[PDB]
Amino acid sequence: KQELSTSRQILSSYEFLGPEFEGLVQEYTRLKDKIKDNRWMLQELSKSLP
Amino acid sequence: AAKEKLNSYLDLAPNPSLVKVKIEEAKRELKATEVELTTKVNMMEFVVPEPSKRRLK
Secondary structure (H helix, E strand, O other), X not given: OHHHHHHHHHHHHHHOOOHHHXXXXXXXXXXXXXXXXXXXXXXXXXXHOO | OHHHHHOOXXXXXXXXXXXXXXHHHXXXXXXXXXXXXXXXXXXXXXXXXXXXOOOOO
């Protein structure tokens, strides 16, 4: 009940910044996922030299 | 169900002007990780020689 209450209060502080902020959050999350995928690809090649 | 919604917001400061700067910084870091993929094909492997190696990670 206490973890549920704290999580709902932080959510309401972001929900007050309006719909345009929620569109910017979605755009940043989509960009951060692509950077993570590209870093993972580089890590697999360097394992193959003796 | 509440915790899974909050993880989508935590990397962003609650100021719209500062979020635009982080979006442009993430776009440049994407561009730099593309260019560091460039040159390390060429100076391919050179020198040393030798024996019985134990070691590594």
